[PDB]
């Protein structure tokens, strides 16, 4: 075929019931995630080609950056709860990987403050049980697929994107291929 298991995607030998339709994992410590977000805009281009009536989910993971890694997973829970994913994603990336000004939970918090979320509102979210279960979901979803690397995309709990097997000479071409793959897998 033109799309083949082991080529543009791999199949999970242990499928995951009830998983979100399009599920993505990243880490603010993850250099390719930085690329995926700021240079490639993968999520956004996938969105543009998905049918609608499909929900798109992105979760942070713990297994990079030790203690700040978990802090970052809680803070992404906060972003999801407050619905400010789109206001903190870029400053979090650059603050971890570019300027290296994120060294503590407190620095993480500064990014939200400078992004306009109020201290009171952030600290309340941070400490809420809604955020606790949101962290829990993020961990559960990674756990269900035995996730050891990022960036990672899974479609309908059964297919995992395999970007290794796509051309990288032209970045635009890599994105469309990636997105088109998600659409193919979507319809499968």
PDB file of N, CA and C in Angstrom, residues 58-94:
ATOM      1  N   UNK A  58      -4.061  17.095  23.930  1.00  0.00           N
ATOM      2  CA  UNK A  58      -2.622  17.115  24.178  1.00  0.00           C
ATOM      3  C   UNK A  58      -2.289  17.050  25.661  1.00  0.00           C
ATOM      4  N   UNK A  59      -1.473  16.068  26.053  1.00  0.00           N
ATOM      5  CA  UNK A  59      -0.999  15.926  27.434  1.00  0.00           C
ATOM      6  C   UNK A  59       0.540  16.046  27.599  1.00  0.00           C
ATOM      7  N   UNK A  60       0.966  16.580  28.741  1.00  0.00           N
ATOM      8  CA  UNK A  60       2.371  16.688  29.106  1.00  0.00           C
ATOM      9  C   UNK A  60       2.798  15.388  29.788  1.00  0.00           C
ATOM     10  N   UNK A  61       4.082  15.059  29.824  1.00  0.00           N
ATOM     11  CA  UNK A  61       4.513  13.807  30.467  1.00  0.00           C
ATOM     12  C   UNK A  61       5.575  14.084  31.519  1.00  0.00           C
ATOM     13  N   UNK A  62       5.755  13.132  32.435  1.00  0.00           N
ATOM     14  CA  UNK A  62       6.654  13.300  33.581  1.00  0.00           C
ATOM     15  C   UNK A  62       8.094  12.874  33.350  1.00  0.00           C
ATOM     16  N   UNK A  63       8.338  12.026  32.356  1.00  0.00           N
ATOM     17  CA  UNK A  63       9.602  11.297  32.372  1.00  0.00           C
ATOM     18  C   UNK A  63      10.780  12.102  31.807  1.00  0.00           C
ATOM     19  N   UNK A  64      10.576  13.394  31.570  1.00  0.00           N
ATOM     20  CA  UNK A  64      11.706  14.257  31.276  1.00  0.00           C
ATOM     21  C   UNK A  64      11.758  15.400  32.269  1.00  0.00           C
ATOM     22  N   UNK A  65      12.976  15.717  32.678  1.00  0.00           N
ATOM     23  CA  UNK A  65      13.276  16.869  33.492  1.00  0.00           C
ATOM     24  C   UNK A  65      12.982  16.668  34.954  1.00  0.00           C
ATOM     25  N   UNK A  66      12.934  15.411  35.400  1.00  0.00           N
ATOM     26  CA  UNK A  66      12.743  15.122  36.810  1.00  0.00           C
ATOM     27  C   UNK A  66      11.678  15.950  37.508  1.00  0.00           C
ATOM     28  N   UNK A  67      12.058  16.627  38.588  1.00  0.00           N
ATOM     29  CA  UNK A  67      11.098  17.251  39.497  1.00  0.00           C
ATOM     30  C   UNK A  67      10.347  18.435  38.841  1.00  0.00           C
ATOM     31  N   UNK A  68      11.050  19.164  37.979  1.00  0.00           N
ATOM     32  CA  UNK A  68      10.436  20.210  37.164  1.00  0.00           C
ATOM     33  C   UNK A  68       9.512  19.635  36.090  1.00  0.00           C
ATOM     34  N   UNK A  69       9.818  18.433  35.607  1.00  0.00           N
ATOM     35  CA  UNK A  69       8.942  17.709  34.708  1.00  0.00           C
ATOM     36  C   UNK A  69       7.539  17.514  35.246  1.00  0.00           C
ATOM     37  N   UNK A  70       7.437  17.047  36.490  1.00  0.00           N
ATOM     38  CA  UNK A  70       6.137  16.848  37.134  1.00  0.00           C
ATOM     39  C   UNK A  70       5.467  18.181  37.357  1.00  0.00           C
ATOM     40  N   UNK A  71       6.238  19.163  37.841  1.00  0.00           N
ATOM     41  CA  UNK A  71       5.735  20.525  38.017  1.00  0.00           C
ATOM     42  C   UNK A  71       5.107  20.979  36.724  1.00  0.00           C
ATOM     43  N   UNK A  72       5.765  20.659  35.610  1.00  0.00           N
ATOM     44  CA  UNK A  72       5.270  21.082  34.315  1.00  0.00           C
ATOM     45  C   UNK A  72       3.981  20.355  33.948  1.00  0.00           C
ATOM     46  N   UNK A  73       3.862  19.095  34.342  1.00  0.00           N
ATOM     47  CA  UNK A  73       2.627  18.356  34.100  1.00  0.00           C
ATOM     48  C   UNK A  73       1.468  18.910  34.948  1.00  0.00           C
ATOM     49  N   UNK A  74       1.727  19.240  36.209  1.00  0.00           N
ATOM     50  CA  UNK A  74       0.673  19.915  36.976  1.00  0.00           C
ATOM     51  C   UNK A  74       0.265  21.261  36.342  1.00  0.00           C
ATOM     52  N   UNK A  75       1.261  22.045  35.923  1.00  0.00           N
ATOM     53  CA  UNK A  75       1.030  23.363  35.340  1.00  0.00           C
ATOM     54  C   UNK A  75       0.280  23.273  34.022  1.00  0.00           C
ATOM     55  N   UNK A  76       0.500  22.204  33.264  1.00  0.00           N
ATOM     56  CA  UNK A  76      -0.280  22.028  32.040  1.00  0.00           C
ATOM     57  C   UNK A  76      -1.739  21.674  32.438  1.00  0.00           C
ATOM     58  N   UNK A  77      -1.920  20.911  33.524  1.00  0.00           N
ATOM     59  CA  UNK A  77      -3.272  20.660  34.029  1.00  0.00           C
ATOM     60  C   UNK A  77      -3.967  21.989  34.311  1.00  0.00           C
ATOM     61  N   UNK A  78      -3.271  22.888  34.997  1.00  0.00           N
ATOM     62  CA  UNK A  78      -3.771  24.238  35.258  1.00  0.00           C
ATOM     63  C   UNK A  78      -4.169  24.959  33.970  1.00  0.00           C
ATOM     64  N   UNK A  79      -3.274  24.935  32.983  1.00  0.00           N
ATOM     65  CA  UNK A  79      -3.575  25.536  31.694  1.00  0.00           C
ATOM     66  C   UNK A  79      -4.837  24.912  31.076  1.00  0.00           C
ATOM     67  N   UNK A  80      -4.981  23.591  31.186  1.00  0.00           N
ATOM     68  CA  UNK A  80      -6.136  22.942  30.556  1.00  0.00           C
ATOM     69  C   UNK A  80      -7.404  23.370  31.284  1.00  0.00           C
ATOM     70  N   UNK A  81      -7.323  23.420  32.607  1.00  0.00           N
ATOM     71  CA  UNK A  81      -8.477  23.748  33.420  1.00  0.00           C
ATOM     72  C   UNK A  81      -8.912  25.190  33.147  1.00  0.00           C
ATOM     73  N   UNK A  82      -7.954  26.111  33.141  1.00  0.00           N
ATOM     74  CA  UNK A  82      -8.261  27.510  32.875  1.00  0.00           C
ATOM     75  C   UNK A  82      -8.485  27.816  31.414  1.00  0.00           C
ATOM     76  N   UNK A  83      -8.164  26.860  30.556  1.00  0.00           N
ATOM     77  CA  UNK A  83      -8.246  27.061  29.119  1.00  0.00           C
ATOM     78  C   UNK A  83      -7.327  28.147  28.594  1.00  0.00           C
ATOM     79  N   UNK A  84      -6.092  28.156  29.077  1.00  0.00           N
ATOM     80  CA  UNK A  84      -5.094  29.102  28.594  1.00  0.00           C
ATOM     81  C   UNK A  84      -3.908  28.394  27.929  1.00  0.00           C
ATOM     82  N   UNK A  85      -4.144  27.198  27.385  1.00  0.00           N
ATOM     83  CA  UNK A  85      -3.092  26.443  26.700  1.00  0.00           C
ATOM     84  C   UNK A  85      -2.415  27.347  25.715  1.00  0.00           C
ATOM     85  N   UNK A  86      -3.223  28.121  25.002  1.00  0.00           N
ATOM     86  CA  UNK A  86      -2.688  28.923  23.918  1.00  0.00           C
ATOM     87  C   UNK A  86      -1.925  30.153  24.374  1.00  0.00           C
ATOM     88  N   UNK A  87      -1.853  30.412  25.673  1.00  0.00           N
ATOM     89  CA  UNK A  87      -1.171  31.642  26.088  1.00  0.00           C
ATOM     90  C   UNK A  87       0.149  31.383  26.787  1.00  0.00           C
ATOM     91  N   UNK A  88       0.325  30.141  27.217  1.00  0.00           N
ATOM     92  CA  UNK A  88       1.494  29.747  27.979  1.00  0.00           C
ATOM     93  C   UNK A  88       2.415  28.788  27.228  1.00  0.00           C
ATOM     94  N   UNK A  89       1.895  28.123  26.198  1.00  0.00           N
ATOM     95  CA  UNK A  89       2.659  27.087  25.512  1.00  0.00           C
ATOM     96  C   UNK A  89       3.984  27.640  25.003  1.00  0.00           C
ATOM     97  N   UNK A  90       3.929  28.746  24.289  1.00  0.00           N
ATOM     98  CA  UNK A  90       5.166  29.305  23.758  1.00  0.00           C
ATOM     99  C   UNK A  90       6.149  29.829  24.845  1.00  0.00           C
ATOM    100  N   UNK A  91       5.681  30.680  25.782  1.00  0.00           N
ATOM    101  CA  UNK A  91       6.642  31.093  26.829  1.00  0.00           C
ATOM    102  C   UNK A  91       7.178  29.953  27.698  1.00  0.00           C
ATOM    103  N   UNK A  92       6.420  28.870  27.877  1.00  0.00           N
ATOM    104  CA  UNK A  92       6.936  27.736  28.655  1.00  0.00           C
ATOM    105  C   UNK A  92       8.083  27.077  27.885  1.00  0.00           C
ATOM    106  N   UNK A  93       7.848  26.745  26.618  1.00  0.00           N
ATOM    107  CA  UNK A  93       8.914  26.219  25.765  1.00  0.00           C
ATOM    108  C   UNK A  93      10.186  27.057  25.743  1.00  0.00           C
ATOM    109  N   UNK A  94      10.043  28.354  25.511  1.00  0.00           N
ATOM    110  CA  UNK A  94      11.231  29.177  25.380  1.00  0.00           C
ATOM    111  C   UNK A  94      11.929  29.354  26.726  1.00  0.00           C
TER     112      UNK A  94
END
